[PDB]
Amino acid sequence: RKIQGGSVVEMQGDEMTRIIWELIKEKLILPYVELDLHSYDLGIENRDATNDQVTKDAAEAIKKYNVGVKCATITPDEKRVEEFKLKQMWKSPNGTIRNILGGTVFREAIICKNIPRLVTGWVKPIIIGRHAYGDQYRATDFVVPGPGKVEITYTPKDGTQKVTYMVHDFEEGGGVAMGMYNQDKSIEDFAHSSFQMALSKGWPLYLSTKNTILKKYDGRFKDIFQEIYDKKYKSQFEAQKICYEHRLIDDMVAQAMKSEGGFIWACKNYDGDVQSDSVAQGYGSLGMMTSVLICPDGKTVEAEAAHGTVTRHYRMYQKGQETSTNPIASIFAWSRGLAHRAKLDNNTELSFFAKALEDVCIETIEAGFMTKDLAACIKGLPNVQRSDYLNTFEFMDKLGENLKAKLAQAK
Amino acid sequence: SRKIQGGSVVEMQGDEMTRIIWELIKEKLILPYVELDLHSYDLGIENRDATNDQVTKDAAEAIKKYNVGVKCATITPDEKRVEEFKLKQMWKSPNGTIRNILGGTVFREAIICKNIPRLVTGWVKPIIIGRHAYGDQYRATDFVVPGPGKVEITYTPKDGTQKVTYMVHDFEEGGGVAMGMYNQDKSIEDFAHSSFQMALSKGWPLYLSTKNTILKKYDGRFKDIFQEIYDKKYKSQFEAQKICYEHRLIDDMVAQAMKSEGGFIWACKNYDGDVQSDSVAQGYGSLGMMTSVLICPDGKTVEAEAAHGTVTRHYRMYQKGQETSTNPIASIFAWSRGLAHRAKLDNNTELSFFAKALEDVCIETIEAGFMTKDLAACIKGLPNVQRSDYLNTFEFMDKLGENLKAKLAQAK
Ligand SMILES: NC(=O)c1ccc[n+]([C@@H]2O[C@H](COP(=O)([O-])OP(=O)(O)OC[C@H]3O[C@@H](n4cnc5c(N)ncnc54)[C@H](OP(=O)(O)O)[C@@H]3O)[C@@H](O)[C@H]2O)c1
Ligand SMILES: NC(=O)c1ccc[n+]([C@@H]2O[C@H](COP(=O)([O-])OP(=O)(O)OC[C@H]3O[C@@H](n4cnc5c(N)ncnc54)[C@H](OP(=O)(O)O)[C@@H]3O)[C@@H](O)[C@H]2O)c1
Ligand SMILES: [Mg+2]
Ligand SMILES: [Mg+2]
């Protein structure tokens, strides 16, 4: 028989990651697990065909069933509009989903003992907690076509004072302008999730902002974190001999670079996006990073890879050129989603399966079978020969055989 | 005097640890050898408070007049600084004020010593960041939203045509924060030109990072302006020099930079240039080993500075009687880069030599094994550093002064 899995929302994506997603389902998931699978095609063509409604439907399903696993998707700009003959420049599906669900996206490298790092000192993990809501990812931006005034206005619902602020008087020429925002409740949730994560690991917590420049906007993040620390977590931190500190973002990225690792890093939405790619690459590869959205309700999660659709590799695939794209992050999206589904349902056999999936990945790499990005970590990209790595399909096949043998040997 | 006649330089004095080092540089390395027409503006936090920040605006206008400014790091106050100095207001960053007036691109690059290991294994060639100096978060209008209500952003054309209003957010429960920011086409164009010109002058490829998939209009404008200027002015020159230009999304770019061998110009928007220049400095060795020069669009006016701040944490050690070992090199190169530009403008051969000698002394001293604790930790690892591995802040300044005196004496 197969493992009885329960309800999981699956979102299919684009380009190289869509292909890998198909390989993962066929070789690693479907032969072993039967799921009540609620599938949503978030491929760019289906999003366009449905006027992006499929994205909103998917987010609602994640809230209902509490577990989503998402493949990387194209976020279109003008070049993608021309490529796919799109009706609109659709918004990022990740931004739409995260805007609805809220929460914190936690990202962490996937570590193999035989893979050298690019950053010499990082002997312990760095976990980024990326605030998943607002800021640049729900902004209202526009081109200023010529001379004129841009202003921003707040009108309270309760008929107290309305306030209009000058953004800029464009005296010559035009430019660009934007408004963005965040919400107190969302920032509070983000603080709680950061403090709880630090206590769960027994590691210090650092929050980064630029509150010397954005004194009101970023100052609010710093103030809410400090109030929540003092009122809810200071004594527990002191019990575990860990600390909480706010640092300016430019100081903090330098401190991270020279650290030994072993800390939680609470990042605003944009910083979390950018620095999670820097951290993933510092440890090894973007293909070796986990990403999980933990919603404030303590039960809903969305797992994904931190990287995109790997367009550059897909262009090689389209030309029939051999590719070696790392599928591990995509595989860990499935394993982390299934592990959460099993934790919610006390599903012992699914818990075992999800862990075995992750173990097979690490064991395969550490035994010396890997894609080109990891071979380059070991050898250096100049010294990498074709015999040092497997292409994407050979690697998927090797994982498939190693998983089959692990599940067989366990029963 | 028989000193080098150096000409007119605008000096802005600063705060905390860098203020201490700044005075040591002037007394030990500059004033013994160079006579300057020095236009000094005290941008210390107490004097900015006493002048209601007017000293900062006056300094910026002086840089416009004399074309050369050298700036010490300054405190940008938040609420805690208001309390510590009993400030009248939460003053704006002086860097932001000066850059907003001058415009241009801030170019940042590590200062490389052959005996100093990197934290990033692959960076064998230089990475030069060109940070757009104007606008975005550093000229933003931000505010607390005290409760439910609507935030909207409006554009009113100057020529009387129809005003446009866009919703930013309808706050339905609780409050939050909101902000507006902007940038100007002319400033973006100047940023593009300076970036393409730096790439051609160094002979390296150029990369622009944005997040135009998310900020499709705002960041798309940067991407479009760069591409149109590249196509119509620089592409044939790039191809002749066998270099290229590419736009990349910022999160891809930071990973590409991490695994690269170096050897590229990196055009960054104001905020990214701020953050990633600290990441790059640390990756090569230390925040104390990075140059920073604002190059204005007029092709004549520059403001040189260190990329790091006032090093408050070391200043607190100094205040409590604990030995400090703060790296002065970036501050020294602020002087040397400023004086080099002064000399280029004036065709002042002796001053050009002096400015280069100053930089050579710094490198030669560290390579000879005399260095502050940050660089000793690069070599040994911080847990293995012993007091005999490094010099304290004043000892290192003295050693630089001895070596500079000796170099200039031999030169004659
Ligand atoms: N979560 C998401 O849905 C998400 C995230 C980011 C971007 N995107 C979309 O993805 C598309 C491509 O964006 P992008 O090219 O900037 O970013 P990307 O897909 O993350 O790829 C950037 C580069 O990182 C490396 N890389 C990433 N994932 C890898 C993997 N699994 N194995 C090996 N190398 C890997 C490759 O470097 P080399 O070229 O050096 O081999 C690749 O070209 C865009 O349409 C973007 O909107 C979506
Ligand atoms: N250019 C400017 O005017 C400028 C730039 C940035 C910040 N600031 C102001 O500077 C003040 C302090 O900011 P901050 O603490 O975030 O940043 P910072 O002054 O850059 O110092 C951050 C940390 O970087 C290291 N570091 C920086 N410069 C160093 C040097 N020359 N030698 C050795 N180590 C060095 C030290 O790390 P360790 O503690 O690990 O030794 C230091 O504590 C704030 O008031 C801020 O507004 C101004
Ligand atoms: Mg990203
Ligand atoms: Mg900075």
Swiss-Prot record, chain B:
**Keywords for this entry?**
Acetylation, Cytoplasm, Glyoxylate bypass, Magnesium, Manganese, Metal-binding, NADP, Oxidoreductase, Phosphoprotein, Tricarboxylic acid cycle
Its UniProt entry gives the catalysed reaction(s) as: D-threo-isocitrate + NADP(+) = 2-oxoglutarate + CO2 + NADPH
User: Which residues are annotated with the PTM N6-acetyllysine?
Assistant: K80, K223, K232, K242, K320
Query: What does the entry list under GO cellular component?
Result: cytosol; mitochondrion; peroxisomal matrix
N6-succinyllysine sites (modified residues): K125, K399
Q: Tell me which residues bear N-acetylserine.
A: S1
- What Gene3D superfamilies does this protein's entry cite? Isopropylmalate Dehydrogenase
Q: List the disulfide bonds.
A: none
How would you summarize its activity regulation? Irreversibly inhibited by Cd(2+) concentrations above 50 uM.
* Record localization: Cytoplasm, Cytosol
User: Where in the sequence is Phosphoserine found?
Assistant: S388
Q: What is its EC number?
A: 1.1.1.42
Q: Which GO terms describe its molecular function?
A: isocitrate dehydrogenase (NADP+) activity; magnesium ion binding; NAD binding; NADP binding; protein homodimerization activity
Q: Which InterPro entries match?
A: IsoCit/isopropylmalate_DH_CS, Isocitrate_DH_NADP, IsoPropMal-DH-like_dom
Q: What does the UniProt PTM comment say about this protein?
A: Acetylation at Lys-373 dramatically reduces catalytic activity.
Example GO biological process term? response to oxidative stress
Necessary cofactors = Mg(2+); Mn(2+)
- The protein's assembly and partners: Homodimer.
Annotated function:
Catalyzes the NADP(+)-dependent oxidative decarboxylation of isocitrate (D-threo-isocitrate) to 2-ketoglutarate (2-oxoglutarate), which is required by other enzymes such as the phytanoyl-CoA dioxygenase. Plays a critical role in the generation of NADPH, an important cofactor in many biosynthesis pathways. May act as a corneal epithelial crystallin and may be involved in maintaining corneal epithelial transparency.
Record-given protein name: Isocitrate dehydrogenase [NADP] cytoplasmic
